[PDB]
Amino acid sequence: RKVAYLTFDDGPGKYTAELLNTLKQHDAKATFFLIGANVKEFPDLVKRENAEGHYVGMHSMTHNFAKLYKNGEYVNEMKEDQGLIANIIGKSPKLTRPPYGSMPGLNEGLRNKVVEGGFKVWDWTIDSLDWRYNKMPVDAAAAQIAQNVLTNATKPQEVILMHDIHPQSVAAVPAILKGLKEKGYEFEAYHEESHFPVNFWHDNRM
Amino acid sequence: KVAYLTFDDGPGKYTAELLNTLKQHDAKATFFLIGANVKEFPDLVKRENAEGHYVGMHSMTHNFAKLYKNGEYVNEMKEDQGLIANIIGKSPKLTRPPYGSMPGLNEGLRNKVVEGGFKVWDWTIDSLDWRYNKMPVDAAAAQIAQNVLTNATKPQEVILMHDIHPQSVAAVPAILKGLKEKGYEFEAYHEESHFPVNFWHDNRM
Amino acid sequence: KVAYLTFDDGPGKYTAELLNTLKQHDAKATFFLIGANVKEFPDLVKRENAEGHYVGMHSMTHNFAKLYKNGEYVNEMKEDQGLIANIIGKSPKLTRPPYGSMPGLNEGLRNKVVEGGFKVWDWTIDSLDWRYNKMPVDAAAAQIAQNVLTNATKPQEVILMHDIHPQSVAAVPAILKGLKEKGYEFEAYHEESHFPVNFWHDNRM
Amino acid sequence: RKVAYLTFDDGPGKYTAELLNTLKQHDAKATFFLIGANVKEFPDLVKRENAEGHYVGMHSMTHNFAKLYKNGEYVNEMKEDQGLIANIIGKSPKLTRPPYGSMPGLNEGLRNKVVEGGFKVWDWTIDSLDWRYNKMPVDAAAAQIAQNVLTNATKPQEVILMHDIHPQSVAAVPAILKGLKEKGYEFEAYHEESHFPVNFWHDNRM
Ligand SMILES: CCNC1=N[C@@H]2[C@@H](O)[C@H](O)[C@@H](CO)O[C@@H]2S1
Ligand SMILES: CCNC1=N[C@@H]2[C@@H](O)[C@H](O)[C@@H](CO)O[C@@H]2S1
Ligand SMILES: [Zn+2]
Ligand SMILES: [Zn+2]
Ligand SMILES: [Zn+2]
Ligand SMILES: [Zn+2]
């Protein structure tokens, strides 16, 4: 019962349709956390992500830690970001992904507000680190980013963190898909039907 | 074919229960205690060592920012070591980093720990007991047992559990027999027996 | 078995010399011109296209901080493109980034270049002609020719030279003879024949 | 006759001793550029690097850009650093290696001043990128860094950039040495009498 949840952060972007075709050609589903400025600039790609069979969840408006967690704007920005996304796909998604991860930004304070707001939070069990490989050939970057992902998948479920806004990332997903499939992983998207906690605070309320 | 049980965030409310459950099965495990739990449950701390388990450290505050982003880790571990040394008269070396060492334990802090004389242990298997919290104990526990019996594949395994959680302690009985028939034996960590088990694959710890 | 000679930082003092040498050997190459040298040597600019060579861009300021750290790359290439266009009646697409595209040409700027309609070309072979500058020409050139002949191994090669340097132009005859013996043919870059040669291996450029 | 010139920046440091020993097993020589405060704290290692056959050059006192270049203390910091290194190994080394490289810090002003004092300046032709691999298991990092330098050795001479002050760096050096040696490289130190220019400004006065 192996299921890979490929997640893509900070999108959508100019590489997204490309990633969206590679997903499609592999009949594989995934999940996308989007920034408010990009849901607005790229409303078609949003609508398409959802249309092609993927989960579209929030990732805030500002992606600003100081704003998100120190001043506690997090859920407000996930509610605003939610509204934009509904206006485009008719769903009001409930899963959020904290910029910079919930640890340590999501204190017990707003972790409460998150559950009192009905929202949900997903961190990740693999960190592709894709976004650091920005100073080298893109094919070389992709191999190392896939190497990272292929060699860290072991648990019955794995939540893989990637960003679809960097070229080296979307170039790695072909190898990543072919690799994990050889490892017997299924490439499903997140479903709200079947939620299970994935965070660093181990708080299973979200 | 050794198998090392580890327990975090204790000693706590069900720790007393757990030590007995272990005892009946001639099983020795490892505990990583929070500072305040050492202050509140000295007896349990004393008892854990007395019944042949390893008593290691899990820091003072279990606070990510303080520990790693501010580098208080070793300071928190040494002070915790002191509190424990006052009960068992031994000063343990083995630390279990709160939330794991990846990425929290940077290259620098990893120097301080090797310099401070400590080792570091993460795990290979996560019981995942925290998912099934505030939930019907026997149902939860049952799952937790599967969670660990399935990922038991390697010659040695280091299992993460938490004895401040009822579902976890309840899960321990089923794990014990299920793993023992898998050819596993349950030993405590021994300092002279040290071998690396850390996400960074850093073998100085 | 093609071989594309490319020349940077021109047109200059020895450019006319080189063009005759190219012409004498019925050989066609590629030039990447700086803006001010286009402004000063329009005839040489005019001549290069006229005799069948490719005339590309090498920016306005050849200044690293301006081009990349300040993101002026495309703009400098755009304005350079226009200056060339006013002479040869074409608006060329192929850019050769000052100092190579690595790492100066980041992911953001690489979009802009793709958006503006530009390609980018680095090289496979570095002549190292700048090492031997202000040096005894006959001696220098001989070495430089060998520097490229040694690294002539692949089916396609893009050789970096500078025709603002006397040792480099002096080296060109021997390369032409040496590569012709290696089975190579010397063609200019042609846009309908474009193929990626960029340190980033970015195949949109 | 190929030659790989391993260079290590920002030392000496706590992993230097292990690097020094690993170099000595493969009878391989290399080049060290050092920071003033580090020559002050680790003179055995300086003294030893030297004594063991490697070149030791400067990498400034402060490793601060605005001080080195925008304020133009490059030559000041290299001579001061040279002074220290001399009092340890009885040698005033002439070769310097600019922090963050020569481009674009060493403007023509500073570059004139550099040749005024008989200094040379070495940049590099391969950036191993070791220091960006501090967020993953060291063995994994060691491997990727290796492949970075192994798959970029093409030119008969390479000058490889590394930092001996990070663990994943000296960890990669064994595989680097086996790798290049398989490609026919030899591992020399820089030699003063044997100077050939390697800088981003193509200035062969340094
Ligand atoms: C100590 C800094 N931590 C991190 N930097 C990355 C961010 O750039 C991403 O946006 C975030 C969410 O996508 O995931 C990691 S976590
Ligand atoms: C804008 C270039 N930045 C760079 N950061 C790295 C630095 O951390 C090194 O110290 C330097 C010289 O040792 O080599 C690279 S280059
Ligand atoms: Zn993000
Ligand atoms: Zn814990
Ligand atoms: Zn140039
Ligand atoms: Zn440096």
Instruction: Give the number of C-alpha atoms closer than 13 A to the C-alpha of residue C13, restricted to the C-beta side.
Output: 6
Q: Which of D58, D100, D132 to mutate to test the pocket of ligand 2 (most atoms within 8 A of CB)?
A: D100
Task: Write out the two tokens for B53.
Answer: 């388990």
Start-to-end CA distance of chain A, whole Å, equals: 23
Task: Write out the two tokens for A53.
Answer: 């069979």
Q: Which of D16, D18, D133, D136 to mutate to test the interface with B (most CBs of B within 10 A)?
A: D136
| Residues whose CB is less than 8 angstroms from the CB of residue B105 and which lie 6 or more positions away in sequence, other chains included | B68, B73, B97, B113, B120, B200
How was this structure determined? It was done by X-ray
Question: Residue D14 and residue A60: Cα distance in Å, rounded?
Answer: 42
Contact C132, D206 (CB under 8 A): no
Cα(B93) to centroid(ligand 4), Å: 17
At which residue do the structure tokens 């020094």 appear?
D20
- Confirm or deny that C58 is annotated as ligand binding: yes
At which residue do the structure tokens 């990498």 appear?
D59
State how many domains chain B has: 1
The verdict on B124 touching D (C-beta cutoff 8 Å) is no
Contact A169, A20 (CB under 8 A): no
Q: DSSP assignment of B140-161, as one string?
A: HHHHHHHHHHHT--SSSEEEEE
Q: DSSP assignment of chain C, as one string?
A: -EEEEEEEEES-TTHHHHHHHHHHTT---EEEE-HHHHHH-HHHHHHHHHTT-EEEE--SS--HIIIIIT--HHHHHHHHHHHHHHHHS----EE--TT-STTTS-HHHHHHHHHTT-EEB--SEE--GGGGTTS-HHHHHHHHHHHHHHT--SSSEEEEEETT-HHHHHHHHHHHHHHHHTT-EE----GGG---B-TT--TT-
The verdict on A152 touching D (C-beta cutoff 8 Å) is no
What backbone phi and psi angles, to 5 degrees, belong to A115? -80, -25
How many other C-beta atoms can be found within 10 angstroms of the C-beta atom of residue C86?
12
* Ligand 2 and D100: CB distance under 6 A: yes
Question: Is the link from the previous residue into C166 a cis peptide, with omega within 30 of 0?
Answer: no
Helix H or strand E encompassing A37? helix A36-41
Instruction: Give the number of C-alpha atoms closer than 13 A to the C-alpha of residue B55, restricted to the C-beta side.
Output: 31
Query: Amino acid identity of B76?
Result: E
Question: Residue A117 and residue B177: Cα distance in Å, rounded?
Answer: 43
| Residues whose CB is less than 8 angstroms from the CB of residue A200 and which lie 6 or more positions away in sequence, other chains included | A101, A102, A103, A123, B64, B99
Active site residue C162: yes
CA distances from A23 to A27, A133, D116, D151 (A): 6, 22, 60, 30
Specify the 3-state DSSP secondary structure of D5.
Answer: strand
CA distances from D157 to C168, D99, D124, D148, D198 (A): 20, 22, 11, 16, 10
Question: Residue C177 and residue C174: Cα distance in Å, rounded?
Answer: 5
Task: Write out the two tokens for B195.
Answer: 């071998």
| CB < 8 Å to A168, chain D | none
The crossing angle, in degrees rounded to 10, of helices D43-51 and D16-25 is 10
Q: Judge residue B31's burial from the number of C-beta atoms within 10 Å of its C-beta, 0-12 exposed, 13-18 middle, 19 or more buried.
A: buried
Q: What is the 3-state secondary structure (H, E, C) of B11-73?
A: CCCCHHHHHHHHHHCCCCCEEEECHHHHHHCHHHHHHHHHCCCEEEECCCCCCHHHHHHCCCH
The crossing angle, in degrees rounded to 10, of helices C15-24 and C42-50 is 10
Q: Judge residue D12's burial from the number of C-beta atoms within 10 Å of its C-beta, 0-12 exposed, 13-18 middle, 19 or more buried.
A: buried
Listed residue (B15, B17, B51, B52) closest to B33, CA to CA = B15
The verdict on D103 touching C (C-beta cutoff 8 Å) is yes
Listed residue (D12, D15, D197, D35) closest to D121, CA to CA = D197
Listed residue (B51, B52, B77, B43) closest to B63, CA to CA = B77
What letter does residue A97 receive in the DSSP assignment? -
Listed residue (D123, A44, B148) closest to C103, CA to CA = D123
Domain span holding position B74: 1-205
At which residue do the structure tokens 């979009």 appear?
C111
| CB < 8 Å to A135, chain C | 103
